[PDB]
Amino acid sequence: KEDKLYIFWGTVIGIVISATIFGAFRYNRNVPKTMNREWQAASDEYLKSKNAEPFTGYSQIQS
């Protein structure tokens, strides 16, 4: 009974470290000019005038 707790709390502290490493490579990114909300709202008007994705959905907004 005192070994399954050890395996569980060994896997949790293996997932927490990788999240903190990946977060450090996430603040320091090269963000291009197209990834902004005021640029992905201008693309929706062009995709609305020339009718695109009629059945499902079109939305280029992901902030």
Binding site: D3, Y6, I7, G10, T11, G14, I15, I17, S18, A19, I21, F22, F25, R26, R29, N30, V31, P32, T34, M35, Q60, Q62
Partner: protein, 535 residues
């Protein structure tokens, strides 16, 4: 001088397997760091780590393909488990051609040097793993990089051919007194059936690579369409090697799983003759299909219909093996030790990665999936989760017998769960990126493919931590490993039964179906003086 005549000038077959293991560990570390370099660039849109260089992205992908198709999986599955276990299972002292075993080892460190020197003298060799003719000419790659990379696929070919002839010649006339070739264990049959494909596939690859070399440097024009040749010929002469190759990587895994399923579930394997016939059928039907990698090149309409028919037939023998493994695990008692965890995680993920192969077999459906990340997600569920899992299970099964030193159970379980979680996070959104339409071999992508690329960059950092924990497991095995056999009862090879008392069990401890687990555990240098007897 005794160091030289025993670890450099060697004859013993079991002492080359440990050198194969030490080489395979290094060549599986290098490619994994190269894969971490790729996955840290394919994270968010833009040009992040490699500043603007689209060379040194294709070079990294090529060198990550070669170092783990040719330098990790084959040396582990042929050198460490084939050279060591096959003489002990069939009951022979050593191999039939021992000096050929020594040359088959020592051809590989000169093959590593040329591949590492194919990425420093020039721009590099960014041709992909499949070195296609009209890109790898003297108009895009003009330098000593492709030439030194196709000389690393000759030495490995010579080593594999010389090992396969040794494996076939040994099992024919070097058996014990009472073994016919119908009482052999299943691992010996796996090694035999991969050694026949190694004979029947490698001359075509050697011919195609040599003709590519003659086209590059002696202006011969086999595959140049300004003199009367076709590039498509090379594709034929590549893929006739290519599809036997990907069964060579997976057939030695299967037999290993059988032993674990036969051991920790205390039942014999359901239908062994059906299993060896199924492996024979899989080995034979891997040579009559090669053109399903080429459906978009412009073939006939009556030739696609043959290769859709001959590809879906291979599902029938593999299902026999899967359902026989289920029938073996059905009735018996199951104790969950660290080989059986990897065994249970292989019967589910090989099925998931293999059911995607039926979707790609159709020529009508391959128009939507060719050169797309669906293919990558298909073959990573089978290569990383089918072969590497079998390798880890084989290591955790046979390492106390070979080495004599035990390991901590808890850290091995933490390693297994970290591999499981990180690898299932990494390769599953590749199916979604493939279905939406992301092509292969691109550093930069449109902004719509961003979000899933943020998630598949997170599991790789989980898997590298599992590799580092595996390194610490090996270190804890080597130091203080004599005192790691009373912590847990995983060290016992088989458990006491219901009626079998403990006092009776300590007198008669090992019950087996092979010669392997009754030896003294360091295996002796000369392990059979008098011959073994089978009725």
């Amino acid at each position: 001088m005794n160091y030289i005549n025993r670890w450099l000038f060697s004859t013993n077959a079991k002492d080359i397997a440990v050198l194969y293991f030490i080489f395979a560990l290094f060549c599986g570390l290098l490619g994994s760091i190269m894969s971490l370099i790729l996955r840290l660039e394919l994270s968010a849109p833009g040009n992040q780590i490699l500043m603007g260089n689209h060379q040194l992205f294709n070079v990294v992908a090529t060198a990550h393909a070669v170092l783990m198709v040719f330098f990790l999986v084959m040396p582990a599955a042929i050198g460490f488990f084939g050279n060591y276990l096959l003489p002990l299972m069939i009951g022979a002292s050593d191999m039939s051609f021992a000096r050929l075993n020594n040359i088959s080892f020592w051809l590989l460190p000169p093959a590593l040097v040329s591949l590492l020197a194919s990425a420093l003298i020039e721009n590099g060799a960014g041709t992909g793993w499949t070195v296609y003719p009209p890109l790898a000419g003297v108009q895009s790659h003009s330098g000593p990089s492709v030439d030194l990379a196709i000389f690393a696929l000759h030495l490995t070919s010579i080593s594999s051919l010389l090992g396969a002839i040794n494996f076939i010649t040994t099992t024919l006339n070097m058996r014990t007194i009472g073994m016919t070739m119908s009482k052999l264990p299943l691992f010996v049959w796996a090694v035999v059936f991969t050694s026949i494909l190694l004979l029947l596939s490698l001359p075509v690859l050697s011919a195609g690579v040599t003709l590519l070399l003659l086209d590059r440097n002696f202006n011969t024009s086999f595959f140049e369409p300004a003199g009367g040749g076709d590039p498509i010929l090379y594709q034929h002469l590549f893929w006739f090697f290519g599809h036997p190759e990907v069964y060579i990587l997976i057939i030695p895994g299967f037999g290993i799983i059988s032993h674990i399923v036969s051991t920790y579930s205390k039942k014999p394997v359901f239908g062994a003759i059906g299993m060896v016939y199924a492996m024979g059928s899989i080995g034979f039907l891997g040579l009559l299909v090669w053109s399903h990698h080429m459906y978009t090149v412009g073939l006939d309409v009556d030739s696609r219909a043959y290769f859709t028919s001959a590809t879906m037939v291979i599902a029938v023998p593999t299902g026999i093996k899967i359902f026989s493994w289920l029938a073996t695990l059905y009735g018996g008692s199951i104790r969950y030790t660290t080989p059986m965890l990897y065994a249970f995680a292989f019967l589910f993920l090989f099925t998931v990665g293999g059911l995607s192969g039926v979707v790609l077999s159709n020529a009508s459906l391959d128009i939507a999936f060719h050169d797309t990340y669906y293919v990558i997600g298909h073959f990573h569920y089978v290569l990383s989760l089918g072969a590497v899992f079998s390798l880890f299970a084989g290591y955790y099964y046979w390492s106390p017998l070979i080495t004599g030193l035990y390991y901590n159970n808890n850290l091995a379980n933490i390693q297994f769960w970290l591999l499981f979680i990180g690898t299932n996070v990494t390769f599953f959104p590749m199916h979604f990126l493939g279905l939406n339409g992301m092509p292969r071999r691109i550093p930069d992508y449109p902004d719509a493919f961003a979000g899933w690329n943020a998630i598949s960059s997170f599991g790789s950092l989980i898997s590298i931590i599992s590799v580092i924990l595996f390194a610490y497991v090996i270190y804890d095995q080597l130091v203080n490993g004599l005192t790691n056999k009373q912590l847990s009862t995983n060290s016992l090879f088989k458990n006491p039964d219901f009626i079998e008392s403990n006092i009776i069990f300590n007198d008669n401890s090992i019950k087996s179906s092979s010669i392997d687990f009754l030896l003294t555990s360091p295996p002796l240098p000369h392990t059979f003086n008098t011959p073994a007897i089978q009725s």
